[PDB]
Nucleic acid binder design. Structure first.
Lengths: 45, 44
DNA sequence: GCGGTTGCACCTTTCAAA
DNA sequence: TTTGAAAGGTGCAACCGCA
């Protein structure tokens, strides 16, 4: 049900501060980041 | 550093494995990079 | 140790079966 | 109505190959 990503503290810090601004969890944020990146890769030519 | 879990369904994990392969990187690398690009998008 | 990866254990919120 | 499984969330422990 999960994958794991090894992050350092600074990146974890940025994720949390960014997620709070947009009224979402860090977890939601990472998933959306993944969906957005995959669409770019899949829509590329 | 620590490992952060992400709840991903099977279709999404295969989309990742497939995209990772055709850019010559690991699934781990793709997720990390996804995170960094998305933070750049938010912060810009 | 870092990148890559597995596998878990506990938390909170949501919401239909009982 | 209650209640616990499912969904969404979080992060610890430890494997590998590597350098």
């Amino acid at each position: 049900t999960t994958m794991g990503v090894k992050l350092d503290d600074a990146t974890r810090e940025r994720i949390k501060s960014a997620a709070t601004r947009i009224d979402r969890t860090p977890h939601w944020l990472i998933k959306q980041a993944i969906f957005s990146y995959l669409e770019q890769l899949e829509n590329s030519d």
